[PDB]
Write a protein that holds these residues in place. Structure first.
Motif, short mmCIF file in Angstrom:
data_model
loop_
_atom_site.label_atom_id
_atom_site.label_comp_id
_atom_site.label_asym_id
_atom_site.label_seq_id
_atom_site.Cartn_x
_atom_site.Cartn_y
_atom_site.Cartn_z
N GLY A 64 0.79 -1.23 0.00
CA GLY A 64 0.00 0.00 0.00
C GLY A 64 0.82 1.28 0.00
N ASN A 65 2.15 1.16 -0.12
CA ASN A 65 3.00 2.34 -0.12
C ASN A 65 3.21 2.86 -1.53
OD1 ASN A 65 3.26 2.60 2.70
ND2 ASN A 65 4.79 0.95 2.75
N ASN A 66 4.13 3.80 -1.71
CA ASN A 66 4.38 4.35 -3.04
C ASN A 66 5.86 4.65 -3.13
OD1 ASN A 66 4.68 6.07 -5.33
ND2 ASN A 66 2.52 6.72 -5.15
N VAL A 67 6.56 3.87 -3.95
CA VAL A 67 8.02 3.97 -4.05
C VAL A 67 8.53 5.28 -4.65
CG1 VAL A 67 10.04 2.92 -5.15
CG2 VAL A 67 8.32 1.49 -4.05
N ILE A 68 7.77 5.88 -5.56
CA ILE A 68 8.23 7.08 -6.28
C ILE A 68 7.76 8.38 -5.65
CG2 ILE A 68 8.20 8.32 -8.50
CD1 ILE A 68 8.34 5.69 -9.95
N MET A 69 6.53 8.38 -5.13
CA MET A 69 5.97 9.53 -4.41
C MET A 69 5.43 9.04 -3.08
SD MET A 69 6.23 12.33 -6.17
CE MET A 69 4.93 13.52 -5.89
N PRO A 70 6.31 8.91 -2.07
CA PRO A 70 5.95 8.23 -0.82
C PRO A 70 4.67 8.72 -0.12
CG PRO A 70 8.32 8.46 -0.97
CD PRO A 70 7.73 9.31 -2.08
N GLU A 71 4.32 10.00 -0.26
CA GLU A 71 3.11 10.51 0.42
C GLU A 71 1.82 10.00 -0.22
OE1 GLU A 71 3.32 14.76 1.37
OE2 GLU A 71 5.52 14.55 1.25
N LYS A 72 1.89 9.59 -1.48
CA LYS A 72 0.68 9.21 -2.21
C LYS A 72 0.44 7.71 -2.07
CE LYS A 72 0.12 13.38 -4.24
NZ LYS A 72 0.53 13.44 -5.66
N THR A 73 0.14 7.28 -0.85
CA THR A 73 -0.05 5.86 -0.55
C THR A 73 -1.43 5.39 -1.01
OG1 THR A 73 -1.09 6.20 1.60
CG2 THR A 73 1.35 6.10 1.55
N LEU A 74 -1.67 4.09 -0.82
CA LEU A 74 -2.97 3.50 -1.12
C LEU A 74 -3.76 3.33 0.18
CD1 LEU A 74 -2.12 0.97 -4.00
CD2 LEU A 74 -2.24 3.49 -3.95
N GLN A 75 -3.42 4.12 1.19
CA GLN A 75 -4.18 4.11 2.45
C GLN A 75 -5.34 5.11 2.38
OE1 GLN A 75 -1.58 1.22 4.59
NE2 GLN A 75 -3.74 1.88 4.67
N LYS A 76 -6.38 4.91 3.20
CA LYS A 76 -7.60 5.73 3.10
C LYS A 76 -7.35 7.22 3.21
CE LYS A 76 -11.55 4.19 4.64
NZ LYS A 76 -12.69 3.64 5.45
N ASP A 77 -6.49 7.62 4.15
CA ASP A 77 -6.21 9.05 4.36
C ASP A 77 -5.62 9.72 3.13
OD1 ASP A 77 -3.51 7.90 4.71
OD2 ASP A 77 -3.11 9.20 6.41
N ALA A 78 -4.60 9.10 2.53
CA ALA A 78 -3.97 9.66 1.35
C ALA A 78 -4.91 9.61 0.15
CB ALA A 78 -2.65 8.94 1.04
N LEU A 79 -5.63 8.51 -0.02
CA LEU A 79 -6.58 8.41 -1.13
C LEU A 79 -7.60 9.53 -1.04
CD1 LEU A 79 -7.18 4.56 -1.28
CD2 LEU A 79 -5.98 5.90 -3.03
N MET A 93 -9.06 10.27 -4.51
CA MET A 93 -8.81 8.96 -5.11
C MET A 93 -9.52 7.82 -4.37
SD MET A 93 -7.10 9.24 -7.89
CE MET A 93 -6.58 7.55 -8.05
N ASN A 94 -10.30 8.16 -3.35
CA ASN A 94 -10.97 7.13 -2.55
C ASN A 94 -12.30 6.72 -3.18
OD1 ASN A 94 -11.37 5.32 -0.43
ND2 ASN A 94 -12.42 6.84 0.84
N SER A 95 -12.22 6.18 -4.40
CA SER A 95 -13.40 5.70 -5.13
C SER A 95 -12.99 4.79 -6.28
CB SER A 95 -14.24 6.87 -5.66
OG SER A 95 -13.71 7.44 -6.85
N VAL A 96 -13.86 3.85 -6.62
CA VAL A 96 -13.58 2.96 -7.75
C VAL A 96 -13.40 3.77 -9.04
CG1 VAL A 96 -14.43 1.10 -9.20
CG2 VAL A 96 -14.65 0.92 -6.76
N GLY A 97 -14.25 4.77 -9.25
CA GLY A 97 -14.18 5.60 -10.46
C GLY A 97 -12.88 6.37 -10.59
N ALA A 98 -12.42 6.95 -9.49
CA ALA A 98 -11.17 7.71 -9.54
C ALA A 98 -9.99 6.78 -9.76
CB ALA A 98 -10.96 8.54 -8.28
N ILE A 99 -10.02 5.61 -9.12
CA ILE A 99 -8.91 4.68 -9.29
C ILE A 99 -8.89 4.12 -10.72
CG2 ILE A 99 -7.82 2.50 -8.53
CD1 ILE A 99 -8.97 3.29 -5.68
N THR A 100 -10.07 3.76 -11.24
CA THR A 100 -10.15 3.23 -12.61
C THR A 100 -9.61 4.24 -13.62
OG1 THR A 100 -12.50 3.85 -12.81
CG2 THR A 100 -12.05 1.64 -12.13
N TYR A 101 -9.96 5.51 -13.45
CA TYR A 101 -9.50 6.56 -14.36
C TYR A 101 -7.97 6.68 -14.36
CZ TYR A 101 -9.48 11.06 -16.81
OH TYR A 101 -9.27 12.08 -17.72
#
Ligand code: HEM
Length: 86
Positions: free
Chosen positions: A21-36, A41-49
């Protein structure tokens, strides 16, 4: 969506940069709820896009993955986010 298949799509395409759930290139932009949520980005539509089209230094996957693949991987990401990637 098929979360088990989404898990496999994630291993094949996303784990290089986002394992755990981390991010190697931009560490702050994780796949955790707070960052999403912070990034709209906390939605299926935003992630799919973003998966389909890429964003900044994240490459695009529209040519590589089917629409179903992308729906499934987005659903997997949100499922893991709910469990803090534990
Ligand atoms: C695999 C197909 C894959 C997925 C799924 C995925 C998801 C994803 C999300 C949901 C975000 C938003 C995170 C946030 O907190 O805002 C995000 C962002 C970035 N990613 Fe990604 N990503 C996948 C693939 C990859 C790969 C293989 C890489 C590394 C080469 C990568 C990198 C990045 C980067 C950089 C970002 C931040 C983009 C930005 O806002 O500047 N992703 N990813």
């Amino acid at each position: 969506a098929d979360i088990n298949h989404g898990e496999n799509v994630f291993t094949a395409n996303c784990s290089a940069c986002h394992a755990g759930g981390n991010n190697v290139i931009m560490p702050e932009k994780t796949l955790q709820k707070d960052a999403l949520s912070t990034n709209q980005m906390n939605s299926v539509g935003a992630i799919t896009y973003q998966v389909t089209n890429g964003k900044n230094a994240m490459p695009a996957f529209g040519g590589r993955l089917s629409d179903d693949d992308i729906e499934d991987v987005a659903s997997f990401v949100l499922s893991q986010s709910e469990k803090s990637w534990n």
